[PDB]
Amino acid sequence: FACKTANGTAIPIGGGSANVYVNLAPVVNVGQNLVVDLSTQIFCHNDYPETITDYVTLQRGSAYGGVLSNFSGTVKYSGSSYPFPTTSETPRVVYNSRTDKPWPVALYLTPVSSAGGVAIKAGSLIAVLILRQTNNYNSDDFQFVWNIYANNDVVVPT
Ligand SMILES: CCCCCCCO[C@@H]1C[C@@H](O)[C@H](O)[C@@H](CO)O1
Known part of the structure; x- marks a missing residue:
């Protein structure tokens, strides 16, 4: 079992971590x-x-x-x-x-009610998602860690 991002960055068998850069509605x-x-x-x-x-x-x-x-x-x-x-x-x-x-x-x-202005900064870490992989075969228990980054600012109008 292995995973890859849209640009081809892979996490191989046994798990590991990778960065994911996402475009966000501005x-x-x-x-x-x-x-x-x-x-x-x-x-x-x-x-x-x-x-x-x-x-x-x-x-x-x-x-x-x-x-x-x-x-x-x-x-x-x-x-x-x-x-x-x-x-x-x-x-x-x-x-x-x-x-x-x-x-x-x-x-x-x-957005929460207090939100306004630049609510997400371009380049900033916005989330970490842990994919956990197991199976019906052996005791493998692997984590694939996805660090999610914003490609651009997000503005919440005031
Ligand atoms: C002849 C015996 C061959 C065993 C192959 C095991 C490959 O394991 C990896 C990681 C598992 O954790 C995963 O379940 C498996 C399938 O995706 O891939």
């Missing part, structure tokens, strides 16, 4: 969602699907910088919504193919 009003869709950014596959079933969870998601300060967060994992920053490990997603499949993660961030 203007987000109070009452609206800023969507950070990682399903277009992170892709994974099973290296031995003939025999092994891989189990993949969002073990946890943490918020940083402007996102922690200025937004109220929800994460959708495989279509279901949970608090972000997270409060529990999600249900599993199975990877049973050698063909790359998106990691079905998206953040939905809505």
Whole structure:
């Protein structure tokens, strides 16, 4: 089991960490969602699907910088919504193919009432997402750590 980002940066068998740089909607009003869709950014596959079933969870998601300060967060994992920053490990997603499949993660961030101005700074760390991979074959328990960075400022109108 291994994963790669949209630009080809990979985390190999056994886990590790990688940076993900995301474009963000430049203007987000109070009452609206800023969507950070990682399903277009992170892709994974099973290296031995003939025999092994891989189990993949969002073990946890943490918020940083402007996102922690200025937004109220929800994460959708495989279509279901949970608090972000997270409060529990999600249900599993199975990877049973050698063909790359998106990691079905998206953040939905809505400004808090005190938010206004540059709510996310370009280049800043906005989130850390931990992908946990196990299987039905052995005792492997690996973490793939995704450090999410903003490519641009996000302005919340006042
Ligand atoms: C003949 C025996 C061959 C064993 C191959 C094991 C490959 O393991 C990796 C990491 C597992 O954690 C993972 O479950 C597996 C499949 O994605 O890929």
